[PDB]
Symmetry: C3
Subunit: 485 residues, 3 copies
């Protein structure tokens, strides 16, 4: 069965993804919960908008929750008459239908990879989470005589698998590291800003790689017309038109994606603010820092291990920069809020009839939230300052650092350039919210004029590895730093 594949790229990608997902049942269950998350968000928002009445809920015999819920018939009648809501529900239904169809198609293709694991590799589905990827790669390459997946090429090699899995991630790394994509901007009051989100990356990959109109013919060969310099201008113009149309589509879909992002951000993070608002101050490796610190021919887990080992030194380093004004404001606000809250709590404990006064419960809640938020900006008063060994420890893991960082380890310029690789979580969320608004502006006005230069890149930096196909040229662009893959 594993002879007529013709899509070894997708086959190896699935073989890797099924091992990274810890088997088949876990993958199926994750996909099911993703679908259920979307359905639950949509249904819960619609129910909140239509069914509940909020009149007999806000009290304007004890009243139950089911009284505030309208019966099914009148709620359906109120739903089917909104007009501006059924037109959103239709689109959110067709999108979910497309997603469910894609999931149904993916299950029938992942069952075959499950069978390929069970029989061809002799690896049970209960030994996957205990087999490193090197062992699975060795079992793939050494048994390539039985399943005979690739006979055209004389043999199979680990480098062949690395090229098959990472044919487009190498192109993305080379495009980001040669400053061929518009992800640096100058803003008044902020300065340099790196705006790279998931929407922008998805749009770049849709414009350049996927679709029947992209630069790559089938899966592993860019169209031969893109290997001839005699028509640079015409190809650049066609790519510009494609980018313009995709940007127009994004601008049209902007409000739906914005509503979805707002709803998801609320349903996902509006409780962490209440309970533990310090979790949104912890930093994470930005999406640009994942493409800047990535080697060529490096799988996702190989990069994630390095980004994990260098996470605590990076947090320590970014904590070595005291923000004085923020700490002053936090200290004083915490003092005032706690001084009012102590009086409120004492009056509540003495005689509890105070809990019946109107705005006492809300005041206690909001003052507790204020104290908890303010006490999260105050660093540990006894912390050491070693901002020079920390960069050495970090560079020993991430392997990449601009050359003007080793000496001046404590300046204000090094921090403002490391913060683009190691960004806040709140900034991540905030620029995830603004992505559906800014992405069309970036695609229409900023990426479109570069459509010529890109055409040159794919023409000058695409090699032909025998048996694999058209791959990206390796680290000849010595704009980055030390390697050690």
């Amino acid at each position: 069965p594993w002879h007529h594949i013709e899509n070894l790229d997708l086959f190896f990608s699935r073989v890797y993804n099924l091992h990274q997902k810890n088997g088949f049942t876990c993958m199926l269950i994750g996909e099911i919960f993703e679908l259920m998350q979307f359905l639950f968000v949509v249904a819960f928002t619609t129910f909140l908008v239509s069914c509940v009445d909020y009149d007999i809920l806000f009290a304007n015999v004890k009243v139950t929750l089911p009284d505030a819920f309208l019966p099914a018939q009148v709620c359906s009648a109120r739903i089917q008459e909104n007009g501006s809501l059924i037109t959103i529900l239709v689109i959110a239904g067709v999108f979910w239908i497309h997603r469910l169809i894609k999931f149904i198609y993916n299950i029938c293709c992942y069952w075959e990879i499950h069978s390929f694991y069970l029989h061809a590799l002799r690896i049970p589905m209960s030994a996957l989470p205990y087999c490193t990827w090197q062992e699975v790669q060795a079992r793939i390459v050494q048994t390539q005589k039985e399943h005979q997946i690739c006979i055209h090429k004389r043999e199979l090699t680990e480098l062949d698998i690395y090229h098959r899995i990472l044919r487009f991630q190498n192109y993305m790394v080379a495009l980001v590291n040669k400053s061929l994509l518009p992800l640096r901007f100058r803003l008044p009051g902020l300065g340099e800003a790196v705006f790279f989100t998931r929407g922008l990356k998805y749009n770049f990959e849709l414009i350049l790689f996927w679709g029947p109109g992209s630069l790559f013919l089938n899966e592993w060969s860019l169209k031969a017309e893109y290997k001839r310099g005699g028509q640079r201008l015409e190809l650049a113009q066609r790519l510009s038109n494609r980018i313009l149309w995709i940007g127009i589509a994004n601008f049209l879909l902007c409000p739906l994606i914005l509503i979805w992002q707002i709803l998801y951000a609320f349903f996902s993070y509006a409780e962490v603010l209440k309970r533990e608002p310090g979790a949104l101050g912890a930093r994470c490796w930005s999406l640009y820092g994942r493409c800047y610190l990535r080697h060529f021919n490096e799988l996702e887990h190989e990069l994630q291990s390095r980004l994990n080992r260098g996470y605590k030194p990076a947090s320590k380093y970014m904590n070595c920069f005291l923000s004085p004004l923020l700490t002053l404001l936090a200290k004083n606000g915490a003092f005032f809020a706690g001084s009012i809250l102590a009086v409120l709590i004492a009056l509540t404990i003495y005689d509890e009839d105070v809990l019946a006064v109107e705005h006492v419960l809300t005041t206690v809640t909001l003052l507790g939230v204020t104290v908890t938020v303010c006490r999260s900006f105050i660093p540990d008063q006894h912390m050491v300052f070693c901002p020079e060994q920390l960069l050495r420890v970090i560079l020993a893991h991430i392997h990449y650092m601009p050359d003007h960082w080793q000496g001046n380890a404590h300046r204000s310029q090094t921090r403002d350039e490391f913060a683009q690789l190691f960004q806040y979580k709140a900034v991540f969320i905030l620029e995830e919210l603004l992505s559906p608004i800014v992405t069309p502006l970036i695609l229409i006005f900023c990426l479109r004029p570069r459509a010529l230069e890109i055409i040159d890149f794919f023409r000058n930096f695409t090699v032909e590895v025998v048996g694999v196909g058209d791959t990206c040229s390796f680290a000849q662009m010595d704009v980055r730093q030390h390697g050690h893959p």
Copy 2:
């Protein structure tokens, strides 16, 4: 006064226990609080069952708590007519009376050890928590001419004290490490299971060591009839009858012990679930792992130091095994629960009349508990994987590891064999609850057929150390690994 003892075993055990309890007043106070804990549990459960009425409490002018409490006379009348409760109270009273009498007898014997510390050793009761056991041992052995506790033997030795204190723990170690006790079982759906609890250990020590019918004549000499192989079968049969009778007694007492265990588990752990349910996921060294990693002639603190030093590497190692399905379920349940709880909290903050709706407070409480529980199964997303150095660091402390562990440090078999030495806290509680049910079945059906082999052990592995008595043979059974006492 310290010449006519005749029970040097118990004397040295008390001298060690008074130092391990940080003096005399702390020991007295701990015993008093244990008695008060038992009395409080029983009295509080009886009061909850009988006095309170729960009719005018559940509301079916503001009502006070003392209204729900029945007056003393009617509560006593309701207690003395239950029949199925006074028969439990009588037994719980005679058991507590026996415990209190034992405590009263132990105080009059520990005051003498206090005097022995003050005068014979010249160690004030305020310098005990600052004197290591080596110093107390040296002061015992070097001043053995004044108090002349042991004149029969020519001198006193540290090894003599070690043998006197640990005469039965060595026997327990040798019995557990030679697989002479039934504590490994095969279960459908679980596989290998090590069931070793405090009830089983207490029953083993009662069957073999304590009592006027055990194998040991007075304190330090097993009956001479157990040193002759001419009557192996008769002694095995007598031991089998003894085990059967003790198992029958345990089976009869099963319901009382089960009720006590349920009540104690509720009163002790039902609040940690509410506030911090992650404390019951932290692991601890099981009761079998304390007898498997124990050297011969090793006091309790000498073993506890090693089990403390190797606690954080063991936690790190057991955390290096990601449970994928549990993490998926936890993530999704936390998302859903928090998404509902955020809406509830926002509606509560906006207008607080919502707090009067019937099932809003209970819903908020249960959803908070659900979020807090689910957020305790999600590991740190940035954690390193070094499961090979961790076993080296652990073995450098616990000194014992099966030989097929060093190489294959990340397999599923090594984890399932280390988890029997380092078990969950929730599993500890759960198998503490099932102990009064399973212990009689283990004693009647599993330990009884081995009654012959044990008789051989005590006959072939009991040496006679001069001046000390009948002790267990040392580590000639090379079934374990590296030592270094």
Copy 3:
């Protein structure tokens, strides 16, 4: 402009303080918030005492908070008739007026230091938090030809700046380390007690350094009459009279300072007890431990770095001393409180009409506080004991240790002598509350008889550094230990 200063001591102190405060705007904002803190405390306490009525608040249609607030006119009438409150308000107003006038005067003098930073040093106010003090010192000393601040002395030196900033802190260090100040006391039931607070230090510096009647003539020269031994007795008598008058003034002001301290302690710490009572068990370097471990000619940040680096080993060391009785009491109290609270929480969750019973909410709150407090005295059950390497690591940072500490690292005497350098936070607060009561007794009865010896000190241990002035003799008093500045 920077030629006619004549007060280089204050100028260099301000230049250092503006850099330690992270610029000018942060300093201004901190001073403003200090003034606002005082004003807020006074106004809030007066409002609580007078305006609110607590009759219609304790409930003896839903009642609002503004109903309990009396209208402005009747509240002003109730304020202006208290008599025993307006006499406190007048004093708290004149003190705040003096503070505000001092702040207004300090701003007009710190703007000049801001200009001196901007122009003379060419350091923008946005590069201060990224310039170590060594760089600012180098820019001060190397550009001393342009601003020509000090021409009398041939040149300027880093040692000159060190002497100018720390002319009185060296005197305080030498006075504390020669046992010339009464800060050790013998108390029945406690033993040795080191009572050194901020009030005592302020009074010492006011008696000896500041004021027109102190020992120092203008700023940098003690009166020549204090360099002649022909009048030791008369000068000692005059100093004794001065100390007596200052102590009488403190005894008169005692009630106001005591009221202020009580109010500030409540408004600042009465919420940390509720939420996280374990933060008041964490230790901090006492005010005596900051003067005992301080080198000569050592700025505040140079000492704070050492006190920061040696904070975690010191906490570990002070945690290695188990308090047995406290742990027993904490365990048992936590058990009882949690056992009652679990029943209350279960009854609350089952049927919520129980929340309307009178003393259920207060009971739940107080039992939660009790459980949270008791669970803060229980140490980690798996902790290592290495109390000998910890003293080495600590001494490698604090540089000072009595000689009888290295060997006997675990005795009860070493802990009771380290706890005076590393005290609790609760003890700090408690002896901050008792300071206005004990300070006059210490100044009148204990410091006054020493008034002769001090007069000898300033006469025998004051050298004349050329260009700087009268400074304190360096570490010739070899009563302390290893240095390495």
